[PDB]
Amino acid sequence: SMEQVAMELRLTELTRLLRSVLDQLQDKDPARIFAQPVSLKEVPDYLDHIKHPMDFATMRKRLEAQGYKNLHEFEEDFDLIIDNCMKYNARDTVFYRAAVRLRDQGGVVLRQARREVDSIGLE
Predict the structure, then answer these.
(1) Cα–Cα distance measured from residue 98 to residue 32, given in angstroms and rounded to the nearest whole number
(2) How far is the C-alpha of 24 from the C-alpha of 55, rounded, in Å?
(3) Are 27 and 34 spatial neighbours (Cβ–Cβ below 8 Å)?
(4) Phi-psi region at 119: left, alpha or beta (left = phi > 0; alpha = psi -120 to 50)
(5) Cα(31)–Cα(23) distance, rounded to whole angstroms?
(6) Domains and CATH numbers, the chain
(7) CB burial class (10 A; 0-12, 13-18, 19+) of residue 74?
(8) Which of 77, 67, 73, 69 lies closest to 34 in space, CA to CA?
(9) CA torsion angle for 29, 55, 52, 78 (degrees, to 10)?
(10) 84 partner at 20 to 30 Å CA-CA among 59, 67, 102, 104?
């Protein structure tokens, strides 16, 4: 149907916007601490602690499959990256501190992304 195609175009548009958001957010992790999934070879007990691991590479895979239907779903995954880190790692670690900085700097980006999604009507 034509309606299905229109919905698919909107999703493709959302995916383009979220790709730009993702690139901007990952720039706020210059150390690449959140770039890849936590290695279960190097941290074998990780899943005893963290029930829903997340990282930028995993988000990018979902994004390119157009697996984020709205901004909220995307934000949920970004918040997992930060919240998982701030539970597993203590306050006096480079990991926790990187998550705090990513959260703070990323909030700015996400604030305007919400306005753009609403404005242009992408969800």
Answers:
(1) 10
(2) 15
(3) no
(4) alpha
(5) 14
(6) 1-123 (1.20.920.10)
(7) buried
(8) 77
(9) 60
(10) 67
Give yes or no for a contact between 84 and 34, defined as CB atoms under 8 angstroms apart. Answer: no
Please check whether residue 59 is in contact with residue 76, taking contact to mean a CB–CB distance below 8 angstroms. no
Q: What token pair was written down for 20?
A: 């730009």
Buried b (16+ CB within 10 A) or exposed e, 97-118: bbbeebbeebeebbeebeeebe
DSSP 26-86: HTT-TT-TTSSPPPTTTSTTHHHH-SS---HHHHHHHHHTT---SHHHHHHHHHHHHHHHH
Contacts of 27 (CB under 8 A, 6+ apart): none
Q: In angstroms, what is the resolution?
A: 1.4
Tokens coding 45: 């007990």
